[PDB]
RNA sequence: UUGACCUCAAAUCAGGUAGGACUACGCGCUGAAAAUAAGCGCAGGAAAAGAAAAUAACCAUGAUUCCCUCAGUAACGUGAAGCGGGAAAAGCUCAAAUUUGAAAUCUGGCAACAUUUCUUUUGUUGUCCGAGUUGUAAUUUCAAGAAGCUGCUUUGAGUGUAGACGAUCGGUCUAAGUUCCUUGGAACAGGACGUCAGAGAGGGUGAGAACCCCGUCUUUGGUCGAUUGGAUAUGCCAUAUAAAGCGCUUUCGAAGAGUCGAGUUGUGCAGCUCUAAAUGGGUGGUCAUCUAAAGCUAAAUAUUGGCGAGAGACCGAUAGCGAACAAGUAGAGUGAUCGAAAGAUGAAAAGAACUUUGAAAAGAGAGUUAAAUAGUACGUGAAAUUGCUGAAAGGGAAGCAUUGGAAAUCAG
RNA sequence: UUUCAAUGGCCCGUCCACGGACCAAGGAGUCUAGCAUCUAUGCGAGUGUUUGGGUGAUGAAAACCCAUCCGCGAA
RNA sequence: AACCAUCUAGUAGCUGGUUC
RNA sequence: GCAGAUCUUGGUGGAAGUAGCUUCAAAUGAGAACUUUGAAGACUGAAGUGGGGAAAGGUUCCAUGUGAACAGCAGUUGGACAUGGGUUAGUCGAUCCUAAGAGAUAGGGAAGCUCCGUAUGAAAGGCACGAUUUUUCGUGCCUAUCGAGGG
RNA sequence: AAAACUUUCAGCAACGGAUCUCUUGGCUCUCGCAUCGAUGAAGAACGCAGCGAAAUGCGAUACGUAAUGUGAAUUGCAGAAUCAUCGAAUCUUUGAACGCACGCGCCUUUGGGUUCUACCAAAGGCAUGCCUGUUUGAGUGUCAUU
């Protein structure tokens, strides 16, 4: 084998001679994702998950990011 | 079409309907309230202003006016 | 227009002449239903089309002020024949007459009872009846797109000044209501067919 | 023949424009949409038998006009710095441009500050 | 006419916002009209029907018939109503639902709750 | 279903061994489950998981209640409790900060704000 | 022997901040076979630009951006700009001059006191330590200005209360047939008789529903809120021993350097070599115009991304997004990447009880239904293609054409 | 309509050769800028509103109205 | 050197087709 | 608007049913050439077609039921699916160590993603003593990290 | 000139899924608005319902909790809601990813045991670059002290 199980994006691209991810480019702290590569943006996005914390704040932004209690 | 639209397409978390539109958003007067009493909510800026007596601009007007008699 | 990253997205070139198979661009990959099949033309399946729709077609068309307002002219002049009102369809056979004017009390009503009840005294009931029995569902697929229905046209009135006129007789099924300063061609002329029908308040009629 | 501008928004542009208007009045009523513009004379042969309006009446218009500079731009007099009266003829012709803008103007009061001793 | 820009009368969209309606909201679609008796003494037309309310089938192949709601089965807009049904072929009987703007309503679940809103929605009681 | 107005008004270690107990009959409820159990007691599972989620919700809210007025006015207080709206809002320059202005600009304004004037016509 | 400092450290020191994502539009930088793509860095709801080291040659104009025009002109197939018309308009801040009769300034600790979208937010007051004279405030910005003299006109970085007025979040209120007759499983259909309409948009309901239901109109609004914008009235405090505008001058007027610029090199800017001045310097045609080498700034403007809406002479399941469906899914490749097919029973499962044959699969009876020519291989169900039935012809072609007979069938 | 007899009839497209097993659906002179001619319409030494401003309550991206400029023509 | 997605619907003087 | 494009996608033929791919008894079972038991005969002949491991795979292991897809035949069969069960450590291995090298840091390049560097012009780790020393610490000594054969 | 076989015609059946009608989807235009993250984001992995594998929701408080609103359900079987709203919380292993590595430590406090100088558990902590301040310092850096 050459490839085994990512950490950070869970694909089986990480080369292990390299130490690097072909997928997503771990350890890098960025993410490898080229604009050639529209496709592969799509593919892993923002969207594609559960974006638990952007629908907290989309849901909060409707009244002004309130804090407090009811009356 | 986008992943982040097809979220909350195959999502079952109702939308965030903001009901905006209003047709002639005509902005109401605050600020003066003599002005803000003869205000006249369906008729526009330039006939509110010349029905007044109150110029709205003292610099020529860059288009046509509005004649609507003889 | 389609979309202009439409047929693009999807993989594939030519295989090279002179393999049995005809020489379109054939997608890559294995194991998928897709793969080994053509795109990129407007001939094969999921392939672009030809001289994909653009938004910068010419939508608006120019036209001579001059011309635009011969053209009203023209069609007002039609609305006072009583010959072209019939074969534009309007059953005013018992119209009083030609040009049908009314009292100036007539701008100022309050109610579609009372906006009813006028057009029957002065006969014109005829052409509201016809435009509300017409009402048909639409053939085809316009009724898909939001233009469930069609039906007729009905008595055009033209008033001076709005003080409640428009909120009494615009519910009617066929009547529209027109201010006289701005005459519009698609209610003096629809489909171009001259002559419609017309009923003008007394001071509407003043201000021709 | 590459990227194109297409103006399908120019009807709502219009409608924008004319709704800032609205909204923009209807914060300060009393007072003009817009300030008042000087008479200037293009710069060039075209163009100098016509009248246009400038940017702002420069600091000799105003001081024979009767506002100082400061006093000038709360009343919506705008000042141009810039420009200069290089003939008695302009100085004129504008002089009496602001001459029939502070007779139409009322200047409303303000509120004072009235300290409890001198 | 609809004059607003607030509301759509798109077909695509009416059709998508009643078939995602959420309980909360699937129970004003099952609204029923007030028979004449109710509807005089109480100056209401209408009301979103509610478990124990005795009606009356307007329209359909029941046509006639009474009986008390069981369940207002609110998923596919229907209405079990008691002592009506149908024959299975094994011999079971599965109720068929009516739907809540065929039926008429003769005698209501009158409670605290409901009370306010005959008269907030301008009635009387 | 234990009724949360009654269990607010509690105190700290009566939740407390509520709590303690509430954790017995759902850990012996699971148990008859896999040994084979009855319709009523498979669905009581749940309403005793949402009571235990109950007290807990009081518990905490008794006990960061305690944190806000211990640490009330005070400069500096835990992150857990201070405004979480936005990374940017809470760097942003405060009103305060933005309302402030030079002396040469409060004078300026002082002597010579903008006016309310009328062109007459 | 003791101390000032200067520089440099260390700490799980007290309090903070940076990173990664999205990237439609923004600003850079790098860069191919167009200053393009790809690459790299960086932001915001806009960014950038921006109050002239600007045009012009006039009777002069007057920050920036954007649109039209200039104009396919000028200059050299590339491809301007000023003027002109519009949209929008708003101006300003430092360094360089002694506060010298007073560092007048500010961070932080603690202590209190209030305030709050808010117990989450934001400050004031006192007090101690420090920062800072190698320069923190006041003053000044070239349009000027300071310092005197003068005599007129002005002044709150306040805090409560109250009402009106706009802005947002949520809740809440809404007219009139389900009357008869025929069709049908179903009346939403046909006819009769009526109503409502500021509502005859759309959708739902067992078939074309203004009057069954949700809505639509009223609503450019009533109602209960919950926060708020800016003015108005009134109360309470107020440092005014002050601060500011404009006449006048027997006084003065600081203005940004390894930067401008000259030589050369890389494609206006940049590298190297050299290196300025003070009516000086820059840019234009002796005159004109601007005053760089420091800074900020709304709006008009862009917006294939985000959060929502409203549409359409669009497509209608080989179309339209790759995806109307469990779609970036099954799947393929070590990997980067690649990547599909598949919508419709019926008004309602009423999804075929039961008997019988069969081990089972199933069949045959039944039964459900308006319909099983609707049985989940489920709307309609074409052609190719096949099986049977009936008719016909066939000796190493058929197909077709014209003319008629035979049989079949239709009309007038 | 089917069959029979009499006479006749080389397999279509393409440039011998190349294509064609059969069927259903899809599938190719389109949109746009400039120019030229011609015909029609409006006006006529004039002509062109739709960069903008005004206005439009009822489909308000429509219609309707217009100031200064500017394009072409008038040497 | 091979591979991958882009540039890219690269390049046609030419081949084949082009619908009543 | 299609008869063609070695057209595209889907369906469908002819070619063609063509090319082609151990024995006996008993029991189970509706059904026995492929199942089971006994019986003989063979084959592998310890370099096994034997018994174990490592990687690898991931439940294929075991029990029960089934025979829809797999099975170039069939099965009463399977690695098929259906339904459950099964891996127990103070002493066995890993975790503990280093080797070649990789390699963060100190630094230095680079318009930049990044590059070099690991002994490098690095303030780079703790030990003891003492009536307590001005009730403010004096005196004395010594000089990273991952990586599988070692335990 | 019989039957078959071959072919044509018609009927029925098969195969197939065209045509038609539909359509909570696409695409295109316009409009309004500005809101990610060290207070742990985007993404990844594991996990949760009485019976769930997908998808959705959610985080050991797990198809939710508190609050407010509505006012009687849910549905496939056996102060409600597989409801709305959303100002309170919970938010496992990771990921910029932060004690060190891809299991091993250190630090402060607290607790347990029919075992208490041992063992164990728990809670809270320990990344780097930079800024202000603080405290502890270094220097044959500068200089002072009758
Ligand atoms: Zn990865």
């Known amino acids: 084998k050459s490839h085994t199980i990512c950490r950070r994006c869970g694909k089986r691209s990480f080369h292990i001679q390299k130490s690097t991810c072909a997928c997503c480019g771990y350890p890098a702290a960025k993410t490898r994702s080229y604009n050639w590569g529209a496709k592969a943006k799509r593919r892993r996005t923002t969207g594609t998950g559960r974006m638990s914390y952007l629908k907290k704040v989309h849901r909060s932004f409707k009244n002004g990011f309130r804090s407090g209690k009811p009356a | 079409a986008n992943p982040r639209q097809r979220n909350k397409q195959r999502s079952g978390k109702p939308r965030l309907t903001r009901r905006n539109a209003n047709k002639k958003a005509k902005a109401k007067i605050y600020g003066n309230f003599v002005i803000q009493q003869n205000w006249d909510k369906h008729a526009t800026l330039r006939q509110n202003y010349a029905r007044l007596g109150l110029l709205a601009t003292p610099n020529y007007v860059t288009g046509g006016v509005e004649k609507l008699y003889p | 227009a389609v979309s202009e990253k439409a047929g693009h997205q999807t993989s594939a070139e030519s295989w090279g002449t002179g393999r049995a198979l005809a020489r379109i661009p054939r997608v890559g990959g294995g194991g998928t239903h897709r793969s080994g099949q053509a795109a990129f033309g407007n001939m094969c399946r999921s392939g672009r089309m030809f001289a994909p729709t653009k938004t910068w077609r010419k939508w608006h068309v120019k036209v001579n002020q001059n011309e635009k307002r011969y053209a009203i002219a023209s069609a007002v002049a039609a609305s006072g024949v009583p010959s072209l009102l019939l074969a534009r369809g309007h059953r005013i056979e018992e119209i009083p007459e030609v040009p049908l004017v009314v009292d100036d009390a007539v701008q100022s009503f309050q109610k579609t009872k009372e906006a009813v009840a006028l057009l029957k005294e002065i006969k014109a009931y005829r052409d509201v009846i016809k435009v509300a029995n017409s009402r048909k569902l639409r053939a085809g697929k316009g009724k898909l797109r939001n233009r469930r229905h069609v039906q007729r046209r009905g008595p055009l009135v033209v008033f001076n000044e709005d003080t409640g006129i428009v909120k009494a007789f615009r519910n009617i099924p066929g009547v529209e209501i027109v201010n006289v300063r701005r005459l519009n061609l698609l209610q003096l002329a629809p489909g171009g067919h001259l002559g419609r029908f017309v009923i003008w308040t007394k001071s509407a009629f003043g201000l021709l | 023949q590459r990227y194109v501008k297409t103006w399908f928004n120019q009807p709502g542009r219009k409608l924008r424009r004319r709704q800032a208007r609205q909204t923009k009045a209807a914060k300060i009523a009393p007072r003009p949409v817009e300030a008042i513009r000087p008479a200037v004379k293009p710069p060039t042969i075209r163009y100098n038998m016509k009248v246009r309006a400038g940017r702002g009446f420069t600091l000799e218009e105003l001081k024979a006009a009767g506002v100082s500079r400061r006093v000038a731009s709360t009343i919506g007099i705008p000042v141009d710095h810039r420009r200069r009266n290089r003939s008695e003829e302009s100085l004129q012709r504008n002089v009496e441009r602001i001459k029939v803008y502070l007779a139409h103007l009322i200047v409303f009061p303000r509120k004072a500050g009235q300290p409890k001793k001198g | 006419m609809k004059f607003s820009r607030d509301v759509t009368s798109s077909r695509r969209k009416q059709r998508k916002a009643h078939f995602g309606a959420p309980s909360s909201v699937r129970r004003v679609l099952m609204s029923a009209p007030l028979s004449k008796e109710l509807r005089e003494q109480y100056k209401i037309r209408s009301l979103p029907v509610r478990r124990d309310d005795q009606i009356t089938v307007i329209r359909g192949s029941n046509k006639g018939r009474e009986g008390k709601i069981t369940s207002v089965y609110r998923k596919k807009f229907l209405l079990l109503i008691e002592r009506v049904t149908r024959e299975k072929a094994n011999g079971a009987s599965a109720p068929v639902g009516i739907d809540a703007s065929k039926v008429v309503i003769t005698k209501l679940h009158l409670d605290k709750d409901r009370k306010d809103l005959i008269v907030r929605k301008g009635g009387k009681v | ?121």
Do not use: C, H, M, W
């Not at chain 6, 303690?20 to 599972?45: D, F, N």
């Open chain 6, 1 to 121: 279903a234990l009724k949360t107005f009654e269990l607010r008004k509690q105190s700290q270690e009566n939740l407390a061994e509520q709590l303690q107990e509430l954790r017995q009959e759902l850990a012996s409820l699971r148990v008859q489950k896999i040994a084979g159990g009855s319709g009523s007691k498979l669905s009581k599972i749940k309403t005793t998981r949402k009571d235990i989620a109950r007290i807990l919700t009081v518990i905490n809210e008794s006990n960061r209640l305690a944190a806000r007025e211990a640490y009330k006015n005070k400069k500096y207080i835990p992150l857990d409790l201070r405004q979480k709206k936005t990374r940017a809002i809470r760097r942003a320059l405060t009103p305060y900060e933005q309302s402030r202005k030079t002396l040469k600009q409060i004078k300026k304004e002082r002597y010579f704000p903008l006016r309310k004037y009328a062109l007459k016509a």
